[PDB]
């Protein structure tokens, strides 16, 4: 269990960074993958190749905590990234590329080290806690569903500028990944 | 099957290939790399998926070729219109100019809209692809299972030249690094 709760922040999704196929709720607290290219203007901030979107918030100092609902989802990537991350084309999620993430992919939980580190989770999470300590260079992930158990911590992170909450809802080739990512209500 | 007498020698068209694809010197094998492969962007190149086309173009006749899929966790294979879109996101369907089958997360499917599940008993290691342009037919055969029929698209509206089509798939799991190979004649 942890004591990051007193550092919780209210995250909203940045529509200008969202892949053109994403459908984001009115309050910008939920996101799902849609079935068509969804009428949005071209900009350099927008992720082009993956169902990714950033939180609107920028962090250059302090301790921040937020929670993400992943109930019923078969794939997702979650964490935090540099504002400077590549938006266009193909790229790997790694600290070198400015991403500190974990994911669910094909029934396996992984930390986004390079190469990936498989995580042994006894209770599949329905909700994920994400903690960032900017000055310390720490990004931690917690299994809210299972006693706030620790999933993984990145340490000695090179943030090298502002950080952004990071989300990938994932594609849905099997039909089993339609569920949204939701930011849990504080 | 009885399509062996229509076999053609297929080679891969480098200019069409996703930029992370590693294509052998003989242009008969392809696998997913972990970085860009120092190729320049062009209008032909698939941008969003690890796809590549055969260099050959067909507007008539009967053609057959074979692809090795040994070990691979995921792939898409078949034939497509030369006019298919190369950029952005799209589904593989006849409406979009693709006649394909795939292996995705332990299920074999045909690329209809919506997808049609296949009835494969023996997991293939090699797939034979037959196209009869005039007949409007694309058929898939399980070479591993004595050439048994997998799937036939008929009443195909080819609507112009066709290209062999390949997708090696991404390798997020670490378990899909295997190449696609064009089997020797």
């Amino acid at each position: 269990a942890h004591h990051h709760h007193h550092h919780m922040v209210h995250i909203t999704l940045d529509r200008n960074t969202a892949n053109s196929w994403l459908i984001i709720s009115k309050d910008r607290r939920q996101v799902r993958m849609g079935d068509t290219h969804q009428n949005v203007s071209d900009n350099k901030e927008r992720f082009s190749n993956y169902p990714m979107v950033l939180g609107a918030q920028r962090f250059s100092s302090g301790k921040m905590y937020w929670e993400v609902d992943v109930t019923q989802k078969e794939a997702w990537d979650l964490g935090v990234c540099r504002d400077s991350v590549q938006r266009k084309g193909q790229f790997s999620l790694s600290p070198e590329n400015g991403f500190w993430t974990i994911w669910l992919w094909q029934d396996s939980y992984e930390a986004g080290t390079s190469p990936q580190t498989t995580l042994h989770i006894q209770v599949p999470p329905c909700q994920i806690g994400i903690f960032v300590d900017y000055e310390a260079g720490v990004v931690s992930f917690y299994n809210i569903t299972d006693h706030g158990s620790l999933i993984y911590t990145f340490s000695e992170c090179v943030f090298a500028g502002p950080l952004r909450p990071f989300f990938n809802v994932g594609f849905n080739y099997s039909g089993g990944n339609a569920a949204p990512l939701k930011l849990c209500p504080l």
Side-chain angles (χ1 to χ4, degrees), chain A residues 14 16 23 32 34 110 140 157 161 182:
Chain A
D14 188 339
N16 286 335
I23 302 166
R32 71 184 201 265
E110 315 280 348
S140 292
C157 299
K182 314 173 176 176

Side-chain angles (χ1 to χ4, degrees), chain A residues 82 85 91-101 103 112-114 154:
Chain A
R82 301 197 186 120
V85 297
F91 55 84
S92 304
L93 301 181
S94 66
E96 308 100 87
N97 284 346
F99 298 90
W100 298 272
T101 61
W103 56 80
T113 53
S114 55
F154 290 89

Side-chain angles (χ1 to χ4, degrees), chain A residues 60-74:
Chain A
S60 289
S61 67
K63 295 170 181 59
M64 290 72 54
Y65 172 78
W66 64 96
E67 301 179 341
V68 183
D69 198 300
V70 297
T71 310
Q72 291 284 9
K73 293 192 64 52
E74 286 181 349

Side-chain angles (χ1 to χ4, degrees), chain A residues 53-106 108-151:
Chain A
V53 53
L54 305 186
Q57 293 65 39
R58 275 80 158 168
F59 319 118
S60 289
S61 67
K63 295 170 181 59
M64 290 72 54
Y65 172 78
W66 64 96
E67 301 179 341
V68 183
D69 198 300
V70 297
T71 310
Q72 291 284 9
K73 293 192 64 52
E74 286 181 349
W76 45 262
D77 317 322
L78 286 176
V80 305
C81 66
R82 301 197 186 120
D83 183 62
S84 61
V85 297
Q86 178 187 339
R87 308 302 168 91
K88 312 297 186 190
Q90 313 199 311
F91 55 84
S92 304
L93 301 181
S94 66
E96 308 100 87
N97 284 346
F99 298 90
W100 298 272
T101 61
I102 66 165
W103 56 80
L104 173 62
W105 182 253
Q106 305 185 156
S108 191
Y109 296 93
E110 315 280 348
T113 53
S114 55
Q116 70 185 204
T117 304
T118 308
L119 277 17
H120 311 295
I121 306 185
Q122 204 151 115
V123 175
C126 287
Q127 305 188 336
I128 293 145
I130 303 172
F131 174 69
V132 180
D133 181 331
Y134 192 99
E135 280 83 358
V138 176
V139 182
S140 292
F141 298 82
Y142 300 89
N143 187 343
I144 293 164
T145 308
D146 190 27
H147 303 101
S149 51
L150 175 67
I151 297 173

